[PDB]
Ligand binder design. Structure first.
Ligand SMILES: CSc1ccncc1NC(=O)N1CCC[C@H](C(N)=O)C1
Ligand SMILES: [Zn+2]
Length: 138
């Protein structure tokens, strides 16, 4: 679990969005596993606008942060799950690092701000949904 809070927006994994997120929907994209909902309170986070390929992510299954080198956002094949059929997920960045399903929502940050959130993983890999291209979040 986990979310980014920026301005009057809450960014979550689309497969983990709540009834309240869908009732206050701003934008969603199943191909990116992202959903953004509106909030009444001002958010605590700021978004990176950069081309960093290194950063640090929070891993809830280890209660720890880990450093990572990650690929540029791209179209990656993701196997079927209880949430989606087998498909290509877009704007996804992969890295070597531990992750389990419940780790989705952990933030990846570089020195400039929030880069994205954990969205996929397996066998020593972790994948992050990029948010740096969503200029309207600011
Ligand atoms: C950190 S998620 C993870 C980690 C380790 N084994 C497996 C997984 N699970 C996954 O990758 N998925 C299940 C939830 C929906 C994800 C999607 N973005 O399509 C795919
Ligand atoms: Zn950066």
């Amino acid at each position: 679990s986990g979310a980014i809070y920026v301005g009057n927006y809450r960014v979550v994994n689309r497969h983990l969005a709540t009834h309240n997120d869908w009732a206050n929907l701003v934008w969603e994209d199943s191909s990116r596993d992202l959903l953004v909902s509106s909030t009444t309170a001002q958010g605590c986070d700021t978004i990176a606008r950069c081309d960093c390929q290194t950063g640090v992510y929070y891993c809830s299954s280890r209660r720890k942060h880990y450093p990572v080198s990650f690929s540029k956002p791209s179209l990656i094949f993701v196997e079927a799950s209880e949430y989606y059929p087998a498909r290509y997920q877009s704007h996804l960045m992969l890295a070597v690092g531990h992750s389990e399903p419940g780790d989705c929502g952990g933030i990846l940050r570089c020195q400039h701000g929030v880069v994205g959130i954990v969205s996929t993983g397996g066998n020593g890999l972790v994948g992050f949904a990029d948010v740096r291209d969503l200029l309207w979040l600011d």
